[PDB]
Amino acid sequence: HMRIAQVAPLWERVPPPAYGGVELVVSLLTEELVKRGHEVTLFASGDSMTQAKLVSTYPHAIRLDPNVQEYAVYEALQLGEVFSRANEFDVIHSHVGYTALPYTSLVKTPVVHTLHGRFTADNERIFSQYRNQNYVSISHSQRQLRELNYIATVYNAIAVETHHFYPQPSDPPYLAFLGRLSPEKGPHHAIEIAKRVGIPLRMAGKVDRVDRDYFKELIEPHIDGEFIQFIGEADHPTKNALLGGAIAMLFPITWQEPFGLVMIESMAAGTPVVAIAKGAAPEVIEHGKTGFLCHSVEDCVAAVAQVPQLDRMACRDYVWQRFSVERMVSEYEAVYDTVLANT
């Protein structure tokens, strides 16, 4: 009973066939909002698949499109189209970060910003200047700047029904890594953990330009092909098989993780998570039940021996209980309600 604009990043399709976190959350939120009878306009790439109105400034995902060199050009096209049409919307829900803040002061339609990223020494200064806007965080640990006007915390979610549940892991045990090959995700940690426990590690993910040196130096020399396997970038079925077959997923971050969608994807498949307790991991993992919070590699190494005891079905039930689209979209509805009323 509202007109809602969803402004997504253009790096990935909505929803992404493989890598993509925000575009996934935007897809789930958008589709469910439309089902609830709202007039939704999706601002996303041209190959996106939505039942809402799709306005696109480029036909394809930009990350893997070979003809595009300047992503910022089409980002600016998107924001120009959105805020030029402000009075065609009751609320604008932006997922593109700080690039939308100077536009918000120039239009009358209220804008809601879901923060999907880490606060940095630089972006804090632009967020500071626009602190009295309606931000929504995806985890409590993310709120490192309290002077911002957080309307609410709305945890992310996945479509649990679409993830196949695995009752028992693969007959010869192996560990899984799923994520972009970045130091922030610590795949080098994951490689050390598997070698010291003696259990193989299967890796999947992208290696975009910023991590090529890191992959060339720390990761690639260790990809054995037998004990350390790497299947670059995985679509939904491939990733669902990878975590499901594993006894546990290594999530050894070295970085203030905003949320970590792979964790709830692992648990949804029934595979618990051995993670280091940084950022949102303590809020996502229930220690000793759906996984194990660790503070060191050895803590993670020791925890892998206590992984078989966990109830794998409890992991899936846990994801259903707190990380469902039903709850997320309802919480996002509460946000729109508040923003339109407390203006």
Ligand X SMILES: OC[C@H]1O[C@@](CO)(O[C@H]2O[C@H](CO)[C@@H](O)[C@H](O)[C@H]2O[C@H]2O[C@H](CO)[C@@H](O)[C@H](O)[C@H]2O)[C@@H](O)[C@@H]1O
- CB nearer to ligand UDP: give 20 or 291: 20
Is 185 annotated to bind ligand? yes
Which residue in 70, 71, 76, 128 sits closest to 103, CA to CA? Answer: 76
- CB nearer to ligand UDP: give 63 or 239: 239
Beta bridge partners of 274: 250, 292
If binding is defined by CB under 6 A, does position 117 make contact with ligand X? Answer: yes
Stretch that binds its own copies, among 75-83, 134-142, 282-290, 322-330 (CB under 8 A): 75-83
Return d(Cα 263, Cα 265) in angstroms, integer: 5
Which partner in ligand X, its own copies, ligand UDP, none is near 210 (CB below 5 to 8 A by kind)? ligand X
Which residue in 311, 29, 40 sits closest to 157, CA to CA? Answer: 29
Is 180 annotated to bind ligand? yes
CB of 174 to ligand X, least distance (A): 25
Burial of 89 (C-beta count, 10 Å sphere; 0-12/13-18/19+): buried
In this chain, which of 5, 23, 58, 103 binds ligand X, going by CB under 6 A? 23
- CB nearer to ligand UDP: give 91 or 319: 319
- Adjacency order of strands within the sheet including 291-294: 228-232, 201-205, 175-178, 249-251, 273-276, 291-294
The DSSP symbol for 69 reads: -
Which partner in ligand X, ligand UDP, its own copies, none is near 262 (CB below 5 to 8 A by kind)? ligand UDP
If binding is defined by CB under 6 A, does position 113 make contact with ligand X? Answer: no
Return d(Cα 225, Cα 251) in angstroms, integer: 21
Stretch that binds ligand UDP, among 46-54, 63-71, 202-210, 219-227 (CB under 6 A): 202-210
- CB nearer to its own copies: give 22 or 193: 22
In this chain, which of 37, 70, 198, 342 binds its own copies, going by CB under 8 A? 70
Beta bridge partners of 190: none
Is 19 annotated to bind ligand? yes
If binding is defined by CB under 8 A, does position 121 make contact with its own copies? Answer: yes
The count of other CB atoms within 10 Å of the CB of residue 249 is 27
CB of 204 to its own copies, least distance (A): 28
- Cβ-contact 269, 165 below 8 angstroms: yes
- CB nearer to its own copies: give 60 or 196: 60
Which partner in ligand UDP, its own copies, ligand X, none is near 208 (CB below 5 to 8 A by kind)? ligand X
CB of 281 to its own copies, least distance (A): 25
CB of 11 to ligand X, least distance (A): 4
| Angle at alpha carbon of residue 97, lines to 93 and 102, rounded to 5° | 85
- Cβ-contact 151, 112 below 8 angstroms: yes
Return d(Cα 33, Cα 48) in angstroms, integer: 16
Dihedral sign for Cα atoms in the order 206, 209, 211, 217: positive
If binding is defined by CB under 6 A, does position 234 make contact with ligand UDP? Answer: yes
The count of other CB atoms within 10 Å of the CB of residue 342 is 9
Enumerate binding residues for ligand UDP (CB under 6 A). 18-21, 24, 178-180, 204-206, 233-234, 239, 259-262, 265
Known binding positions:
19-20, 180, 185, 234, 239, 261-262, 265
Enumerate binding residues for ligand X (CB under 6 A). 9, 11-12, 20-23, 116-118, 120, 180, 208, 210
